[PDB]
Amino acid sequence: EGCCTDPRCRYQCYK
Known about the structure:
The chain has one helix at residues 7-11. The protein contains one helix and no strands. The protein is flat. It is mainly alpha-helical. Keywords: Acetylcholine receptor inhibiting toxin, Disulfide bond, G-protein coupled receptor impairing toxin, Ion channel impairing toxin, Neurotoxin, Postsynaptic neurotoxin, Secreted, Toxin. It comes from Conus regius (Crown cone).
């Protein structure tokens, strides 16, 4: 969801 790249989302790529 174009979030994995982000640091905050990177922590939880699978939500």
